[PDB]
Nucleic acid binder design. Structure first.
Ligand SMILES: [Mg+2]
Ligand code: NA
Ligand code: NA
Length: 325
DNA sequence: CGGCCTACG
DNA sequence: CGTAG
DNA sequence: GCCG
């Protein structure tokens, strides 16, 4: 088992779901307390279990696995022996965890805002609604739409959204293309938002594209909220006899950068953090969603595909459905 | 012990 | 500060 | 919290 998540296939479904879920609760709780290091370790340990070929049945099977030390091993041991881990259950039922989870789920609210509200004594969404001047426009939209945004987006919803995005993109710039990214590109059947990447085969033609796309979607009445190359939107999606709000992200990249942007926006989040960590620490190359830089030659790698990027970094290629770290 | 991804709005 | 994978 |  290699130590970086980008060095191993991780499928969407696996053989250690309960164990990974428990470690991810502790990762989430670490993040609510501002402990990014502990968050990363628990995320990585969870991800190692997702990559195993069969269920962990005995504590012995953790020996040698990366990111399993005393703490993560104890969590697993308690789950194997008793079916529950006391620490995990204490987190789950804690007022702090539940409220921080509720507040940070709001579009426009991060850990720092949620924590301040928590320390002020706020606990529920209606608490927030009763003092609306205390909220940004973005937070107001996130609160108004919170119920719809909590409802899973289905793959059927995604196909409908992609056609309407393509129509606006085609008027904004004939020849521009729309690619589904994020979790749905990794094979998820549901999700909490839809991610699209837009480019044009003629380098430079994509300049100024996103405003033109946004104005066209808004003129079609489809945009419930929007605030450039990244747009974080709430879209009106038709439903039987009505509609629902859906989070949609639209990103533009020049075709020279498209493989990097595709790689970055396909995720998973942990996969990409691990890939960038691997690039820099193991290969001395600096990776982002725009390119891959050699800081000794002061040159950027040209890539025509995701396959090119994995080759550059000396990694076996993983298709999107094996990037579910 | 230092490090923990790296951007854009 | 928020957002994204 | 863990790795190197
Ligand atoms: Mg997504
Ligand atoms: Na949020
Ligand atoms: Na998104």
């Amino acid at each position: 088992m290699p130590a970086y998540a980008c060095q191993r296939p991780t499928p969407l479904t696996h053989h250690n779901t309960g164990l990974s879920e428990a470690l991810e609760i502790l990762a989430e709780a670490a993040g609510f307390e501002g402990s990014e290091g502990r968050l990363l370790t628990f995320c990585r340990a969870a991800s190692v279990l997702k990559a195993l070929p069969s269920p962990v049945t005995t504590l012995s099977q953790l020996q040698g696995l990366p990111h399993f030390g005393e703490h993560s091993s104890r969590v697993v041991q308690e789950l194997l022996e008793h079916g529950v881990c006391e620490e995990v259950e204490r987190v789950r039922r804690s007022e702090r965890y539940q409220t921080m989870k509720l507040f940070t789920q709001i579009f426009g609210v991060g850990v720092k805002t949620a924590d301040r509200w928590y320390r002020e004594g706020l606990r529920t969404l209606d608490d927030l609604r009763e003092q609306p001047q205390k909220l940004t426009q973005q937070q107001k939209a996130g609160l108004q739409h919170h119920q719809d945004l909590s409802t899973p987006v289905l793959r059927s919803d995604v196909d409908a959204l992609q056609q309407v995005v393509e129509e606006a993109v085609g008027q904004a710039l004939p020849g521009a293309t729309v690619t589904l990214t994020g979790g749905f590109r990794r094979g998820k059947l549901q999700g909490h938002d839809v991610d699209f990447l837009i480019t044009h085969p003629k380098e430079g033609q994509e300049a100024g594209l996103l405003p033109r796309v946004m104005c066209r979607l808004q003129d079609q009445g489809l945009i419930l909220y929007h605030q450039f190359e990244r747009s974080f939107c709430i879209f009106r999606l038709p439903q039987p006899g009505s509609w629902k709000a859906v989070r949609v992200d639209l990103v533009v990249a020049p075709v020279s950068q498209f493989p990097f942007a595709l790689l970055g926006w396909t995720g998973s989040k942990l996969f990409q953090r691990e890939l960038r960590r691997f690039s820099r620490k193991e290969k001395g190359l600096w990776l982002n969603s725009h390119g891959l830089f050699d800081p000794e030659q002061k040159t950027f790698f040209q890539a025509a595909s995701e396959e090119d990027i994995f080759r550059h970094l000396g990694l076996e290629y993983l298709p999107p459905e094996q990037r579910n770290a």
